[PDB]
Amino acid sequence: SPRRTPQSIPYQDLPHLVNADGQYLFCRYWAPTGTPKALIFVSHGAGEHSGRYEELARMLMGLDLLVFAHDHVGHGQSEGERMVVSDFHVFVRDVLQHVDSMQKDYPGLPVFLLGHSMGGAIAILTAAERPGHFAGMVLISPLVLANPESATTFKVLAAKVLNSVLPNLSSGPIDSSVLSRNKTEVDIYNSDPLICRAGLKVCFGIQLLNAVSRVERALPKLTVPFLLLQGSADRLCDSKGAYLLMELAKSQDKTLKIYEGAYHVLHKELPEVTNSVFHEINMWVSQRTA
Ligand SMILES: O=C(c1ccc2nc(-c3cccnc3)oc2c1)N1CCN(c2nc3ccccc3c(=O)[nH]2)CC1
C-alpha cells in the first residue's frame, strides 16, 4: 500500500523527495515558460507549510526564476510526527539535498534562498554551510533572537525537560493575532487545515533554542548577499536580532528595511506593508539576476 501524506494522499500522486532519514517531503515548483535566470528555494517557518508562499512564489516566477520549496519534516504534507525534529540541522540537511538535486536538473544557474521566521534561521544556516555557493538570501523576520520574554519563559520549561523525562510537556500556542495586523490574513491562517495549531512541544522549542545558538555562531562567518526585512513591532523574532545580523554578518552586500509598526509576518501584513515587501524583494532579486 502506497506511502501517503498525513492527509492520506499517496506521494505517488504528488511532487516529492525522500530525505536522508527515509521520510517523504512534499515539494512545490513554480517554473517560468522560458529559460530560468536563477533558482530560488523558499523555506517556510514553524507550524506552517510551503503553500503559504503561493503569491510570493508566483511573483518570483514572473521574474523568470525557477522557484522551489518543500514542507519541512513534521510540517504540512511531508511525513514526520508533527512539529518534532531529531535535531534542527535536519531541516538544513534537507534543504541542501533539494538544492543539490535541483542544481543537477538545472546546472549552471545561481541559487537564492528565501526564508521567514524559523525558515529564515534555516536559510542562514544553509548559506553558512556552503560559503560562497549561494547568490543571495532574502530574509523575512528571520529567527535570530527570540522575543526576550518568550526566550526566558521557555528556557525555564526547557530546564524541566532537559533535567527530567517529560516527553509531552508543551508551551501554549502562539496567538496568531499578535503576529499580523491584517485581521483577514489572521483569519485565513487560522482556517488552513495544514497549519499546526497546538503549542510547541518543549523538545521542539529546545531545537529552536539550538537554532538561535547556531545562528549566533554562524553570523561572523556569513558572507552571502542578503536582504533583511523586519517589522519594528515583531512579538516573535525580536527586531534586535535583525540589527545584530546587520552588524555581525561579514557579507559585503547586506541591506535592512524596517517596517515601522509592522508585526511579524510581513508578507501577510497590512496591504501597504505586504505590497512593499513584494516590491522590494522584486527589486533586490532583479538587480542580482540581471
Ligand atoms: O516560524 C515561525 C515560528 C513559530 C513559532 C515559534 N516559536 C519560536 C520560539 C520559541 C521559543 C524560543 N525561540 C523561538 O520561534 C517560532 C517561530 N512562524 C512562521 C509561521 N507563522 C505564521 N504566523 C502567522 C500569523 C498570522 C497570519 C499569518 C501567519 C503566517 O503566515 N505564518 C508563525 C510564526
Numbering used by the authors: 6 to 295
From the paper:
To confirm and study their binding modes, the co-crystal structures of four inhibitors (17, 23, 27, and 29) with human MAGL were determined. Compared to the human IC50 value of the starting point, hit compound 17 (IC50 = 445 nM), all newly synthesized compounds exhibited enhanced potency. Compared to the binding mode observed for compound 17, the benzoxazole motif on the left side of the molecules is inverted in the new compounds. This flip is likely driven by additional hydrophobic interactions formed by the new substituents in this region of the MAGL binding site. The interactions on the right-hand side of the ligands, including key hydrogen bonds to Met123, Ala51, Arg57, two crystal water molecules, and π-stacking with Tyr194, remain conserved compared to the original hit structure 17. Additionally, an overlay of the three inhibitors (23, 27, and 29) with the hit structure 17 is depicted.
